[PDB]
Amino acid sequence: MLFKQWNDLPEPKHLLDLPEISKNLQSLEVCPVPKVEFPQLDVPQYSTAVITTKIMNPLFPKNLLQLTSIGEIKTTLTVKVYGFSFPIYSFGKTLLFSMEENFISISPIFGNMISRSIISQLAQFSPDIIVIGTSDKIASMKVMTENECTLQPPEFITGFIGSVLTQLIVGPSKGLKFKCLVAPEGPNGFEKLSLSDMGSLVDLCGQWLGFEPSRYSEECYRLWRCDSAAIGAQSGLYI
C-alpha cells in the first residue's frame, strides 16, 4: 500500500454500539422498562441452581444428565413490541438457567431484568448457587465465592454474568452463597474459547457437579467439537 486513506480516522470508543430501544432519540419522555414473568416449578425441590449462557451448553450433556424442560420465563417490552422466552432446565435436583445473548439484537436491559427476577425468586429459599461465564478482561480461569475475589485490577466481568453477580452481591437480597467460574474474545453471544480453557471448564464443572471424570469428559469433549459456538475456527486456522 502506498498510503492509508485520509478519511480513515478512528471514532471515539467510549460509546458502545448497543441496539436502540426506541427510534426517537430526541424525546424527553420516560422509556418503558421490560417486564419479566417467572413461571410457577417447585423451588424447594431443587437444592442447586446453575446460571450461565448458551455458550456453555456443551458442559451439560443431554443424555447423561437427562435434561428436562420445566417452563419458560417470559419477557415483554412495549414501545409506542419485543418478546423473549427463557427456557429453564432441570437435571436430578439441579436447576439450569441458560440465557442467550446477542449484542446485535438483544439489549442488556432484558438481561438486567431477567437477572433481577431470577435472583429475587431464588432468594426465597437460599439454595446453592453456581454461576458459569466468560470475560474478555481476565488473563486466566477464575474461581470466586461470596467471601473471596481472585480478580486483580483492572480485570472485571460484564454482561449477563455481571448482572447476576451484581444482583447477588449488592442487590436487595444479598448475602447468598455462590461459586462463580469464569473463563478467559468476541462480542456478547459470539465469544470464542481456547481448547485448554474448555478442558479446564469441563474438569472444574465435573468436580463441582459430582460426576465421574472419564465419561463426563468424553461427553463434553464430543459436544465441544460438534461445531459449537466457541469452537468456530480453531481446527481450520491453527495447526
Partner 1 sequence: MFLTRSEYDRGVSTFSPEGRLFQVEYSLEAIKLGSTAIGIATKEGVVLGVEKRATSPLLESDSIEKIVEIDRHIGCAMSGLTADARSMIEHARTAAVTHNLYYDEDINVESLTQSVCDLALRFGEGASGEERLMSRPFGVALLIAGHDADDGYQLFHAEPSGTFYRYNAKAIGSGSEGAQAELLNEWHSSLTLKEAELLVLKILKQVMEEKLDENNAQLSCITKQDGFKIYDNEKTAELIKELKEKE
Partner 2 sequence: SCLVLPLVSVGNIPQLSIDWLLNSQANEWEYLEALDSKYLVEFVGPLDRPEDGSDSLYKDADMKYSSALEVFYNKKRGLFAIQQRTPLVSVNYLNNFIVEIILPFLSKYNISEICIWDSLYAMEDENGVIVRPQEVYSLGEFYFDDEAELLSNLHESMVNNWLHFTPTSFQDKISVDQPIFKILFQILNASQRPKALRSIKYCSCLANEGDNSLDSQQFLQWIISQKVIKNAPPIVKFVRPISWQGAYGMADARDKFVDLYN
Partner 3 sequence: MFRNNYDGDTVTFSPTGRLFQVEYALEAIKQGSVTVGLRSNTHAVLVALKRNADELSSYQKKIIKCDEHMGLSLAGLAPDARVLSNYLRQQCNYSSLVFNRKLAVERAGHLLCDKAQKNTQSYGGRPYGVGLLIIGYDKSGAHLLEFQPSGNVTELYGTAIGARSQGAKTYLERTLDTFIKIDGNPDELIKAGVEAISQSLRDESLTVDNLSIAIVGKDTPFTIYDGEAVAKYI
- Residue 87: strand pairing partners: 72
Query: Quick check: 167 and 121 in contact, CB under 8 A?
Result: no
Residue type, position 121, single letter: Q
Q: Give the contact letters, 153-192, x = binds to partner 2 (CB under 8 A), - = no.
A: xxxxxxx-xxx-xx--xx----------------------
Q: Please give the Cα distance from 45 to 42 (Å, whole number).
A: 5
CB 72 within 8 A of CB 39: yes
196 binding partner (options partner 1, partner 2, partner 3, none; Cβ < 5 to 8 Å by kind): partner 3
Q: Interacting stretch for partner 3, rule CB under 8 A, among 89-97, 164-172, 175-183, 218-226?
A: 218-226
What residues between 60 and 119 interact with partner 2 by CB under 8 A?
107-109, 111-112, 115
DSSP helix/strand/coil, 132: strand
Number of residues lying near partner 3 (CB under 8 A): 20
Query: Residues 159-198 vs partner 3: string with x where CB under 8 A?
Result: -----------------------------------xxx--
CB of 130 to partner 3, least distance (A): 24
Distance separating alpha carbons of residues 109 and 86, to the nearest angstrom: 15
Q: Say if CB 118 and CB 131 are below 8 A apart.
A: no
Q: Under the criterion CB under 8 A, does residue 212 sit at the interface with partner 1?
A: no
Q: Answer whether 160's CB lies under 8 Å from 78's CB.
A: no
Q: Applying CB under 8 A, does 227 fall inside the site for partner 1? A: yes
150 forms part of the interface with partner 1 (CB under 8 A): no
The piece of 47-55, 103-111, 166-174, 219-227 that touches partner 3 (CB under 8 A) is 219-227
For residues 86 and 171, give the distance between their C-alpha atoms in angstroms, rounded to a whole number.
22
Give dist(CA 52, CA 100) in Å, integer: 9
Answer yes or no whether residue 141 interacts with partner 2 by CB under 8 A: no
Select from 7, 10, 40, 170 the one that contacts partner 3 (CB under 8 A).
Answer: 10
C-alpha distances in Å from residue 13, one per residue of 10, 156, 159, 193, 233? 8, 18, 18, 24, 27
The residue ranges that bind partner 1 (CB under 8 A) are 10, 13-17, 136, 153-156, 158, 185-187, 190, 192, 194, 222, 226-228, 232-233, 235-237
